[PDB]
Structure formats: C-alpha cells, structure tokens
Symmetry: D2
Subunit: 467 residues, 4 copies
C-alpha cells in the first residue's frame, strides 16, 4: 500500500531545518540535481529534514510532497556523522582520511536503513518505481525488496566507488554489497565505478558477472543473483543546464558581477573557489598553489585576488573540524604575507551564499578553481560553465573529479602535483581571449547537451527495462 | 664491459654497516630471500652498504662478491628516507600513511637511480642478465637499457603495486611507468599487481597490452612498446624452506624453545609477533585485539602471554617514529592493566634477534600473529610454517598479505575487523590438536614445495625466454 | 541546629563507591592523613562518595559517621573535573599544565560550595568547630560564616598556594580570597604558602596584614577584615607514623617483601615509585632518568629493576589522559630497549595496590624515587621512611615537595635537572650501608616525632585560640 | 685597554642584517629605547648583527660606533634560539610555554657570554662604565669583573624576573644568579622584580640582603657579596616621548591616518594591535575577544574593524611557529564568519611596518589593544599615548604589563578574564569624548614626563654612586 507510483529516497530532503525553526535549502549536489527533477516530475521524496527528533508529518513544498524521516540524536551521531561520514565517505574517497570502523555505528546504520526502507514501503504504491540515492542508504534496496517484492528498485551512488583493494577493508563489505545487489539497477557516475562494483561482485559474492567494460549510459553490465539479474551502469550526473544558463543572463546578475569586481577594488583577475568545506575538495591545494605563486612573484599581488566561498558541512565530525582549522590558517597566513591593510589577496566566506549571489560570483570570476583530491562528479564545474554564456572565464579542473571525463577542454590538473597546479593557474590567468572562448564554447556544448534530464531519463529507462 | 654474466641490483646489500665499524645482516625479506639464492648461484650483487659516504671498494662476503654503492647524507635523506620510504612506500601500501610529494626528493631519486644503473653497467658483461630489485630502483631498467642495449633486464617489485586510482596520484607516474617498462620482464608477487600494472600501461602510457588475467608463474601478460615487447608476470616470493626446516630441527633450538617457555614462567599459551617496526605490519592491531580479549576475560591473563619482536626500521622517517611511540604506549598500557609485578602479559623487544634465537621463538610459539594491513608477501608467515615440523602451532594471517593467497589453511583475518581478529585469536588458542596439525601439515606442504628456488627459477626462465 | 561539635568537610569521604555497588578506600593523601585522625577522635565527616547522584543517607563506617553530599553528573564534570582539577589544580602547581578558565565551571563551583556549606550547617551544633579541607572548597568558609556566625571555622589547604604572579591570573581571584578569609584560621603546609597568602591579602583585598615571616606551627600571621581577625599559619601535614611503623614490622609483610624480590628474579637493586598518575608527580622524570642511566651503562640492566605503582586518577580530565599515554609510552620504550623476554627492567602497575602489599613494596625497595615537579607535601616519602625500621633503603626526594623542608637527610634533587637526578640515583644505589643507615635513622627521627597527631593538634589548638 | 669610557652591551645591535646583504632596523623595545639614547650620548655599542658568521669589523652608523659580535650557526641555534629564547624567555614570563632545559644549550650560552665579555673588555677603557643589557647576557657581569676589575658594571633586565618558585626550576639557577651579582648595580623595570631577585639572593646564594621593599628609582636594595656590595633597583623603561609626540604631529602622518581610514572603507571604529608575534603578547586573547563580541552582536560588524600588525620574531623556535599557526587560524576564522567579500573585519599584516606608517596607524586607531599575558614593560602602550596629542583614542591595557603600573588611567584588563576583556573593549569603543580625553591627558602627562632620558639618568646616576 501507498499512494505514489514514483518515490525518491535520500538521506537529504531538498529542505533543511535550522535551529525556533526555519527552512533553508539543503546543501550538496545531490539536492542540486534532484530538486529540479522532482519539481517537474510527479513523485514523492523521502528523506531526513536535517534535525534530530523532527515530526514525520508530510511536508508540501510547492507541488512537491516530502515525507520526513525522524532521526534521534544517537541516530544522527552514529548513522550520519559516524558510519556515513566517518566510515564510508573517507573510505570511498581513496581513504584521504583514515576511516573509523566501529560496530555500534554499523548497527545504527542498519537500523536507520531499515527505517528508510519501511518509510519507502508506506509511500510506495503496488508495483511502484523506487529510486534510492547514495552511500547513506546502501542497505535499503535489499531491505525494501524483502518487504516489497512488487517494487522496481533503482540505486544510484553519487560518490566514487573505490578500488577493491580499499573497499575490502570494510568489515561489513559483504553486507553492503548484498544491500546494493537488492536493486534491479545499480548506477554509478563513471564506468570505473561500475567496473569496481562488478569485480567486487565476483570476488566478494562469487556471483557470475559480465566481464566486458561498461559504457557511458550504454553497454550495461549484469550480475546474476540466483533467480534475479541486476543491471549495472554508468550515468554521469549533471545540472539543469539550460535553466541555470538563462538565470545567469539576467541584467541584475550581470550588474551584481560588475559590483563585486568594484567591491574588490577592480582587480585585473579574480580566481574563485566554491565548495562545501570538505577534505575531498582540495581547498588546501588551491590556497597553497596561490601562496607559492605569490611568493615566486608569478602572480601580481596588487591586481589578482582569490575568493573562496566555503559552506560549513558535517561540522561535528572531527576530521572536518581539523580541515576547517587548516584552511583558515592558510587564509590568515597568505593575507598576512601578501596582503595590505584594506586589501586582502584572499577573501574567504564560511557560509552558504544565496543562489543569485553565487551566480554573480561565477560570472565575475576570470578563473574557476575546482581542485578536488577526489570527487564523484562535481557540479560546481558544470555550473560555472553554464553561467558563462559570454564565453569568458577559464575552468581549472582536477582530473580526479568525475566531471573531468566530460570536460576535457578545461585546464586539467593533477592536484597532487603542485607545480602542475601552479603552472596551470598561470596559464589560465594569461590565456588569450580566443583560446579561452574556444574552450568555454566546447565545455558549454557538452554541459548544455548533457544535463540532469538526460541523466535521469537514461537511468530511469534502464531501470524500466528490468520490468 | 664488466666481468659478471649475472648481476643482482638492490638498494640493500645482504650486509649492513653499523656506526668504529661493524657488519650486521641486513634487514628485510628481500635479503632473506635473495641471500641464500646468491650464495648458491654465481653472480654479483650491487647495493648500498647501509651507511652514508662508504667506500665503493668491492666486498667479498664468502664466495659472494658485493659491489657497494656510495650514497651521500643528502642521498640517504632525499632518495632513501624521502622518495623511497615517505613517498613510494606509503603510496604503494594503500596510502596507510599520507604520501609526501616533493620535487627535490624526486630529483634525488632520479640521480641515485642513475648511479645504480651506471654501477650495474660496470659490473655487467656483454649480454649479461641483470635482475633489478624493488621500488627504490624503478627507473634503473630504462636507464640501464639506454646505456647498455645488449643486456637482458628483469625487474621484480617486492611490495604491492597499488590500484590505478592511487598510483595516479604520483606526480611522476609516467616517468616511473616508463622506468619499469625499460625491463624485458616486470614481475610482481601477485596477479593483482601485474593486472594493475597492465591497466596502468593502457591508461597512462597508451600502449597496447594483453587483456587477459595473469596467471601464477604462468599466462604472462605483455606490453608493446614500439619495437619491444615487455613481459609481465606474477611470481610469489618465498624462503629457502628446506634449509630453515632442517635448522629448526636442531636439538639446541628445541632446547632453547623449552627454555624460553620456562623463562616466561611456563605459560599455557604463547602468542608471537615478529616484524620490522613498520606501520604496514599491524602490530597495533594485534596489541589492541589482545588488550580487548584480556578486558573481556576471553583470554586468561595468568597463563597466556604475547611476545612481540620488533626490528627498528627507517627510524629517521617521522611516520615510523610516531608508530613506535604508539606501539610502545600500547605495550605499557596493556601491562599496566593486566600484568603483575614480575609477570607482564606482553614482552616487547625493540631489536633484531639472532637467527637461531628467532627460530627458537617460532618453535616455542603456540600462535603466530601475522596481522599486516598490507604486505607484498610476508615471509615471517612462511618461516613459522617451515619451523613447525612438529606440526604444532597455529598461524593467524591477515588476508591483506600476499602470503594469504598461498596459505589458505591458516586462520585468515581481516585486520580492520577487530572482532574478527579477536574471535580468530580465540579460535587459534583453543584449536584441537588434530585441527592444528591438519592445518600445519597443509601449510607445510605448500611452503616446502613453493620455495625461493621455485620462485627464482620461474622468474629467470621467463626472463631468459625474452632473449 | 545539628548534633556534632566537631565536623570535617572535604570533597572526599574516606570511602569511594565503585560502579552494582562496592566501597573502596578513597585515593589521595588527604584521606591517608585524616582517616586515622577521625577514627580516634569524635566528630562527623562531610564529603562526596565518589559517584554521581548518590544517596545522602548518612553512612556509618565503623565508629565514624559519614554524611554524603550528592553531586549530579554536571556537578562532577564542571565543579570537580572542571574548576577543581582543570583550573585550580594546575594553577596552584606552578601552571605545569595550562589552566582552563571557564565561567560555567566557576558558576558550578560556587553552587557546589554552597551545597557543602549548607550540608555542614545541618551537621554542625551551635558553636561547633568546623574544619574545611582543601582547594575544592575554598568558598565554604565565607558561605558557612554567613549562614552560621556561631561557628568556629578552620580551613587547611593541602596543595601549594602559588606565587602571587600566577594566582592573579584567576578571573575569580578576589572571590576565592574572600572565601578563604571567611575562616578564623587559614592553614598551609609551608610558611611560603602562608606568606604568599598574606601578600595576596595585601595587594588583592587591601587588608592590613602582619609583615613578618610565618613560622612552622608558630609565629602566626594575621589578616584584619573589618571586625574580624583571621589567623594564618603553616602546619606541615604528616602520617600516622607509629602505626605504619608497627604495621611494617609484621612477619607476613617482611616475608612478602622477600617474595617480591624473588618474583623479580632476585635483583641486586630495586627502585620504587608510588603515586597517583598525576602530572605533578614527575613519574616521567624518573623514567627518563632511569632510561638514560641504562643507555649510559651506569646502571646494570641485568640486576637493577624499577617498579612503578601508579593509581589511576581524574581520568576523564584530558591532561591526565595525555599524561597516561606518555608514561605508558616510556615504559614500553625502556623495556623494548633494555629488557629481555622474561625480564623487564621496568614493572608498571596501573591500579591501586592493597595497603599491606604496598607496605611490602616499601620494605623491598632499595631506593624510593619521589620526584614530583611540585607537591604540597607528599606523604609517600614519609610512608617509606616509617616503613624502614630496619634502617635500610634510600629516599631520593624532589626539593619541590613540601616534605623536602623536613626530610633534608634524604637525597634531594631538582627534578628539572636530569643530570642531577641521574647522578643522585647512582649515589643512592651505591651508598655505603653506614651512610644509608645514618640518613634513614635521621629521617625516621623526624617522621616518628612529627606525625599527623602533632599536625592536627597544632592546627586545632591555633583554631581554638581564635574563640 | 680600549678607547671607550662608556659601553653598552646587548645581544642586539640597533641594526639587523638581512639575507646579498641589507641593513634593517632591529626589532624589539630594547632597541627602541636604547637607540635614541646612544644617538645623543657618546659611547660604544657591542652586539650581534643578526646573522651567523658576520664580520667583526667595526660599523659606523651615523655618529654611533657599533662593534659586532660573530655568532656561528650553532651559536645562533643553541645560545640564541635555544637557551635564550626556549629556556629563559618562557621561564621568566611565568612559564607561558614549557621551558626546555638542555645542557648543551647552557654550555653554548656560557661560551657566547664569555665572547661578549671579552669583546666588551677590548672596547672598554680603564675604569670605564659598562652597561650590560638583558637576559641573553646574564653571565657577562661576573665574567667581565674577573677580566677587568677596574670597570664599573651595570646590568638591566628588560624582561620580568620571575617568582622564586619558578626561577628555582632552572638547573643553572646558581650560576645565573652569580652572573648577575657580578654587577655593581642590577636593575629591573619593577620593584616586584627587584624583590624577587633579593629573595633569590637570600635563599639561593645565602648572601645578606636588605629586607625592605624597593622603591621606584629610589630606596635601593643591597646584596653583600664578600667584599662587595651590589645595589638593586627598579627603573621602569620608557620611550623618547617628546620626539615621538612631535613626529606624530606632522601633516603627512595626519593625512596618512585619514587615508588609512578611507582605505578601510571609513569605519566608525578602528581597533589596533601592534606587537612582535610572540606568545607573551596576547594577540590570541584580543582576537578571541573580538570574535565573541561579533558573535554576541555587541560590536557592529559593518562599521568596526580590527587591524593587527605583527612582526615575525624568533621564527625558527617551534613554540613561535605554533603560535603563528594559531593566530593565523583565528584571523581566517573570524573573517570567514563575520566578514564580507571586499570587507574583512580583521586586517592582519605579518611584517615590520615602517616607522612613519606605524605612527599613522596609532593616530588612526580609536582603540589600542595591548593585551599581553606578561610583559616586562611594553613600549607600544607608551608609543600610542605619545602619538595622541589630539587626546583622542583609548588604551586597553593588560595589568600583566609593567606599563600598567604607570598607566593606571588606561582601561586595565586581566587578559585571562575574557569577559572582562570583552566588557572593557565595549567600554572603550563607546566612551564619551570627555572621558576619553580625560584619560588620554592623564596618560600623556605621565609618559611625557617619564621618558627614556629619565630612566637612563636614574640608572646611570645609581651606577655612578657605586664608585
Ligand atoms: N559556499 C556555497 N554557497 C552556495 N552554494 C554552494 C556553496 N558551496 C557549494 N555550493 C553548491 O553546492 C553544490 C555542490 O555540489 P557538488 O559540486 O556536486 O559537490 P557536493 O555534492 O560534494 O557538495 C553546488 O550546487 C554548489 O553551487
Ligand atoms: N625482530 C626481528 N628479529 C630478527 N629477524 C626479524 C625480525 N623482524 C623481522 N625479521 C626478519 O626479517 C624478515 C622480514 O621479511 P618479511 O616478512 O617479508 O617483511 P619485510 O621484508 O617487509 O621486512 C624475516 O626474515 C624475518 O624473520
Ligand atoms: N598505586 C598506589 N597504590 C596504593 N596506594 C597508593 C598508590 N599511589 C599512592 N598511594 C597512596 O596515596 C597516598 C598519596 O598521598 P600523597 O603522597 O600525599 O599524594 P596525593 O595526595 O597527591 O595523592 C599515599 O597514602 C600513598 O601510599
Ligand atoms: N609590526 C610592527 N611594525 C613596526 N614596529 C613594530 C611592530 N611590532 C612592534 N613594533 C615595535 O617594536 C617595539 C616593541 O617594543 P615592546 O612593546 O617593548 O615589546 P618587545 O620589546 O617585547 O618587542 C615598539 O617600538 C614597537 O613600535
Ligand atoms: O547531506 P550533507 O551531509 O550535508 O552533504 C551534502 C551532500 O554531499 C554529497 O553530495 C553527498 O553525495 C550527498 O549524499 C549529500 O547530501
Ligand atoms: O632496506 P630497509 O629500508 O631497511 O627495509 C628492508 C626491506 O623491507 C622490504 O622488504 C623492502 O621490500 C625491501 O626493499 C627492503 O630492503
Ligand atoms: O580526590 P581525588 O581527586 O581522587 O584526588 C585525591 C586527593 O589528591 C590530593 O591529595 C588532594 O589534595 C585531595 O583533595 C584529593 O582528595
Ligand atoms: O632580539 P629579538 O630576539 O629579535 O627580540 C627583540 C627584543 O625583544 C625583547 O625586547 C627583548 O627584551 C630584547 O632583548 C630583544 O632584543
């Protein structure tokens, strides 16, 4: 029973309650991609409203119906801050930080996944399509299948799927793999993730799998699980490109971008970073590179400025606190060394910026610095590109983002190679107008054609074909 | 020119000079495997004598001729402590510790590799066979080929070759890969390493490669490099099994093992660890597991004792210093909590133990704890097995060692799963005599048949076939 | 109202409840000194039973009546772990650790002090004598005077009173001083403490004070506070010397001391440390000194052994956790370097030892190592002396203990001067029998004559004279 | 022999060589006070030119003759960075940081002191007056007296002299005290320092001393040392007040102060800090206080700004590196939380500012924040006062500076009491014009009358009287 023929399930709702109450837009690219999707398409969205011990009364946000899931304080600590973001997040991002393996966290993760599955069953009509999202909910597909074998179940992982050598560290590796194999379709951004999953299915579970490489939105892999076949595919996520492109063309935004440059004392060049404050994002790398370019006199400290817009994220997790301390030290250091009173070389904001203000920064920025150590996709890169209909700008992009597989005309860097990052920043800052416009035209052709609608259609058509 | 038809090249000589002078046996399993080899087989051995600014006068150690390579203090700091053991070692072992990427270290690594290549050329006769060993010398095969295209060149990596996702971090990834591809044969312990290398050769270099899985000592892969073909294979290293087996049978060693038990106050059960003090070895894991078993009263603190024999290693490297501090804290902690005055539960020695004393500990030990987080092979596991001709004992072995692929009848553990480690230690401590003997007989059948002679013959026959 | 003519108030009761319930003897020298006192003398004892949220039902422990004070979990965290032991304790011991100044902790400290005052008033008969103990309760005398101006109130500080330059850091310096000035008599171990308090009363409060030096149990100072005069004195605390001396003579204890030496493999020399695991105690100093003597070959690692008996203390306070980690590291380090399997050079126990076992260790020990960085008195030094009626042994004693002012015939050291500590340990280990006996006879003459009865009589006679 | 009748000896020359060569003004208040002195008065100045392995060729800087002292790299590391600034500096400033006691450092300190003494003897004529400066050179007076008993020798300590309880930690306490007692006159900023020294002379040396309090520039103490009497006094150092006052009146400086306010976007209120980046200076305290006032909305983040001018100091000393990291973190943090792009709330410069630019900042600043945890005097406070002939401004001053004993009309704070610091900053920011001018007039009366000339005359008249 349940009234919805199409249900999305994620740890996040598109809204986030702030503590007296107040709704804000939820952070992260998962919401950035899925929100415009569910605003245009009928369907229900199940998720946590971002505070402990909330109501579970349905919330109507416009045309969209949200079903909130209650998490206790202990749930938030052990399932969300703990297993999800201090076990899985670091492990799947190439153990950039040492994962913590904790059995109590695992037990809570199982409990919460069960709660999400049950909530899904209550929302889902007979024979509904259910699309489960991301690493917090990897047990839900198997749990949901056991409760509701009538459902068609898709799972998409929004973060990298790590190499088998690292995944095998997880004490609950088999349970996680079994969880994912409960879906009819398991999707990843990149073929590499899909292939890691297929190999894992062979070694760990001993299931028969396809042995061919996986294509992009094509040439799907398969895993045989007794009576069932699980389809495996790569579907690189994107943004609502055309909408953002139109938004960035507004006179007010173009005016605001000019004002931002005026407020910065009309620099010749503005470099911009935009990220959650997360250790995967390489904010420390871009600051170090900028610092060394200033030290070497390869960037002019009088007419070049870097703006970093960092959103606070997962702040109770100790690794994130330590990262914040390190980034803020770099900011103070660089300004102390190269700034003047009344004129910093680095402007750093530790807050979410309103959407239209963010777009104005994209339009103002001569160089976009997107330097993650590892990122499943990175939508900030694609957002910048969509905003530059003027064909100005330059995107400096880490090759360890999923986006680099699509945005080859960007200035690609190995963020571990600081000399390469430094050389490339100089190249982007000094590019000719024609070379800049050539690259930006090429990037925009890709991003405008490969949008979130193409992504969702591809995944859901593949999911439907399992019926 | 040069007089030797067969030359081995490694950072280590089999001897190590201590600072007044004194020769000691060199540490590590590379010397453990290669020393008995070169004692029986004609050939020269090029390597560093373990001190800065040594002579380069040839050294005759028995029948064996050694050609020492001089390293300056800066060479030792930047090539050996730096690039080799603070860049490559952590990276190739699944970034257990964060690698440091430093261009000065790279430049020194290149310089030293060049020196080893030149030294090799001087020793090597026209058309000689040269066998280059391990991660410190990955540039030597290409360098040597350019100096001496008449030579047949083999390379063997004694440590894991990491997944492509991690290897690609290395700023000098291409130069390292090109270096290895200078060999006629590149060998790894395991098919997994060989397969990682083949994939890497495809993505990074763009060379045509075989696509099939690689066998054990068979079904070799190939990489096409313009005019040349490079063979790629898996050859799991081992020990001089029969010799060690005979050594362990000596009356004096059996008597010493009984005395060791007496000196420990005749415990019912002795657990033993033997390793270099290296963060890959999981000494912290086995101590934590023992501590928790004592806390839970699952091991009897009155009649069960753990002996850890740790060899100081790479002590100037800060990560190794921090590891030592942590291990020594665990030792003091556990004894403070569960020991009595005059009766520790953990005995910890931070020194190399003489060979016959080590063998006596192997014979005394009811349970061998070999719990690395990652190990290319681990010869300690195989040494224990070779020593237990009495068929007593139990081997607890991490699945993240190369040895686990051969020693399946051991008690295998995921060292990240502390509950699994704890449960398994209890199982080994309480095994029936018949189950213990069954496993030990099976392990010994494997280790006695698959010895260092089989390994070397397999590699060298494959190398010879490239002529 | 209240039934007792004599009431002692301290944060500790002589008993400590362990978490299922169980009574143990309370830690610390305050209980060591006051327990035998109150067992012989009529009177009530008010204090906290060592667990959160206890009953406040009166407890009869032998002839002694105890009135427990309830502390909530927050009280324990903010008043006891917080203000008392992370603000006052480090500050008064020469900021060995950085004090934390926290207003919430202060507010809780005030609240709890009020509760102790009220509890005291309920126990105290009209015109009773009340003796308030130590740094946790410095506000109680003023609070109690305001509730009960009929009472005669004494306060004794069991820890050092710091130099004015450090005391003045305290944001609540004036409130603390006013608190103490509520007493009729304020006592310290040493004239130096009394003199620091007098100076403080002059600068901080602006009260007229005596300007002369303060004597030992004589030549008291005075502070004029409007209508009242507060007497200030030095009264060095001690132990029940004669009782301990008789206890140590028992055949069983002498036999146990011989057995302990046998269990240690009959060493020629035993060094002993006995302390709470507290950063004031210099356990790290004595271990470093021992380590360096072994390294230098000035102590024989085959026949000399160090035993450290450390009682866990204030374990939730982070500074204490960090100290434990450091001490346990030193223990593991020293044994790894100089021990043999089956023969440590350091035996370390992290538990309270039963009294008769402790006495046996005192009797067994050739050298007693009492090396605090700062200690109000240190009763362990005096206990050792009382136990050695055989006149054997040697006391190595830091000059930064209050006991050093009385035990001048001990081997005094500056614990900050590691060479001095090392030289002195060698001197004590190699003393002639006659020199050892001469010193021990002199120390015992002092300790047997200056016992806890002399201390209490001196303080209480001075207090009575204020009536 | 030697040509000068008056010689000053200090670790610093008034000039500092930068590494290619370049002379800069030396840092610190010792040079700020002594430079104008020696520019007006005949005499020689012996000191180190701020680089290792310099010439010792005499340097003529204007009318002033400088005799440089050569220090080797090891001298700089062990005498200057080591004993002086990682042993004495933290110890004498109330062990704000844990002192390191190292015998090699002591031995180097002795050697270097000997070199300074010998250099002094070569410069000093028969019967000359020699004035030795500060904690780096405490052994020189005794050394110089032994070489040259004809000389009249003064010593002045520019940093606090710590309470006896802390000074006694020093393993070389007696040698240091003997060193100072080689002078005819030993001077300190404050009576408290002089009194600590007298007590120390009694306990440690056992010399007869005066027992009375010491006056300001009067009522001197005395220490009897066999045949000699050593005078002890308090002489609070100051600046060349009238000269600085006149300098600050220049039109260009007043214009620059207006421009600085314009460059900051014309804030209503500017707070200013000026210090060496030293852990004694409480830069962390003022930043924390500002941060919390912003969080609490007690300061307007739109029209109030803080400028911190920090001079890099002793940067190779690890404690100073850790301080820099912490301060720079606070700067980045506060701006990230409360700033806007193009508008920081904290401007931080990590460089020495030219004198006339510094004076312009003093004139611009509505509130001067001088919040040391401990400072011998602090001349920045007096400089600010001398600059405000307009009678504007407000000085917020830690009571743990020597200057607080003279500048009582400043807004005094206990920097450990963050609520007090916060309340006081608000009071200073919101003072009435008349109250501000009243305080500033009072402060200026003091500083203009009590200048460096009064200080030097007082010390030198006292020194002359010993002849
Ligand atoms: N400081 C910020 N202010 C406003 N929006 C931000 C900020 N940082 C990130 N975002 C937004 O969050 C989303 C990030 O998505 P993505 O780049 O895929 O990374 P992630 O999902 O890991 O957070 C983007 O839509 C991006 O514009
Ligand atoms: N504490 C020790 N004392 C004596 N020999 C040791 C000690 N620790 C390790 N060894 C020896 O060093 C060699 C280790 O080889 P292996 O297990 O392959 O690891 P690795 O090469 O990484 O050091 C073995 O021959 C082993 O017996
Ligand atoms: N490990 C221990 N086992 C048993 N008693 C101990 C232990 N450590 C200290 N004690 C006892 O605690 C008391 C310590 O008193 P004291 O030396 O004045 O120091 P403190 O009061 O600071 O703890 C002594 O009576 C001493 O014998
Ligand atoms: N950032 C700075 N730029 C220029 N001058 C500075 C700076 N910081 C401190 N000074 C100057 O250094 C001297 C500091 O003297 P003082 O306050 O007594 O402290 P200290 O001697 O401990 O450095 C002042 O003359 C002051 O103006
Ligand atoms: O939801 P947060 O923990 O605040 O992080 C925001 C988002 O970060 C990434 O995009 C994750 O893949 C999402 O699952 C997550 O929602
Ligand atoms: O040579 P060390 O740095 O002392 O380490 C000892 C050995 O450790 C491992 O076995 C390495 O694979 C060897 O290359 C190395 O020789
Ligand atoms: O009571 P604890 O915190 O366990 O410490 C034990 C004792 O240590 C010292 O002796 C203190 O002066 C006492 O007040 C305290 O009771
Ligand atoms: O000389 P620096 O180490 O650079 O420090 C600068 C100055 O700081 C303080 O003023 C000291 O009292 C001086 O002796 C010192 O010269």
């Amino acid at each position: 029973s349940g009234d919805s023929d199409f249900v999305v399930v994620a740890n996040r709702l598109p809204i986030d309650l702030e503590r007296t109450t107040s709704w804000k837009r939820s952070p992260g690219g998962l919401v950035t991609a899925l929100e415009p999707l569910l605003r245009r398409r009928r369907g229900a969205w199940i998720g946590w409203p971002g505070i402990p011990d909330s109501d579970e009364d349905p919330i109507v946000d416009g045309d969209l119906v949200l079903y909130p899931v209650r998490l206790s304080a202990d749930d938030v600590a052990q399932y969300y801050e703990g297993f999800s973001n201090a076990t899985l997040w670091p492990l799947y991002h190439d153990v950039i930080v040492k994962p913590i393996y904790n059995r109590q966290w695992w037990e809570r993760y199982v409990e919460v996944n069960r709660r999400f599955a049950e909530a899904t069953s209550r929302a889902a009509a007979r024979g509904a399509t259910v699309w489960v999202q991301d690493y917090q909910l990897q047990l839900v597909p198997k749990m949901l299948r056991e409760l509701r074998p009538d459902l068609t179940i898709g799972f998409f992982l929004h973060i990298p799927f790590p190499p088998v050598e690292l995944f095998m560290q997880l004490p609950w590796r088999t349970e996680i793999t079994d969880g994912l194999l409960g879906a009819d379709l398991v999707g990843f951004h990149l073929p590499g993730g899909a292939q890691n999953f297929l190999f894992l299915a062979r070694r760990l579970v001993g299931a028969n799998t396809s042995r061919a490489s996986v294509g992009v939105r094509s040439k799907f892999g398969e895993v045989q699980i007794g009576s069932r076949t699980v389809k495996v595919g790569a579907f690189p996520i994107s943004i609502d490109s055309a909408d953002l492109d139109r938004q960035a063309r507004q006179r007010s935004i173009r005016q605001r971008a000019r004002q931002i440059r005026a407020e910065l004392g009309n620099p010749r060049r503005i470099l911009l970073g935009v990220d959650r404050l997360d250790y995967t994002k390489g904010i420390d790398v871009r600051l170090q590179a900028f610092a060394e370019l200033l030290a070497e006199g390869r960037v002019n400290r009088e007419d070049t400025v870097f703006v970093q817009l960092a959103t606070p994220s997962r702040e109770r997790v100790e690794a994130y606190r330590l990262l914040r301390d390190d980034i803020e030290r770099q900011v103070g250091h660089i300004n102390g060394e190269y700034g003047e009173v009344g004129h910093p070389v680095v402007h750093y904001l530790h807050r979410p910026v309103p959407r239209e203000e963010l777009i104005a920064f994209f339009v103002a920025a001569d160089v976009m610095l997107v330097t993650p150590l590892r990122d499943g996709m990175n939508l900030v890169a694609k957002e910048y590109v969509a905003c530059r209909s003027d064909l100005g700008g330059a995107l400096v992009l880490s090759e360890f983002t999923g986006a680099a597989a699509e945005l080859g005309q960007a200035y690609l860097v190995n963020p571990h190679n600081l000399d390469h990052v430094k050389d490339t920043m100089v190249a982007a800052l000094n590019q000719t107008p024609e070379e800049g416009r050539r690259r930006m035209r090429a990037l925009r052709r890709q991003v405008l054609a490969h949008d979130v609608d193409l992504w969702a259609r591809s995944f859901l058509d593949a999911l439907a074909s399992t019926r």
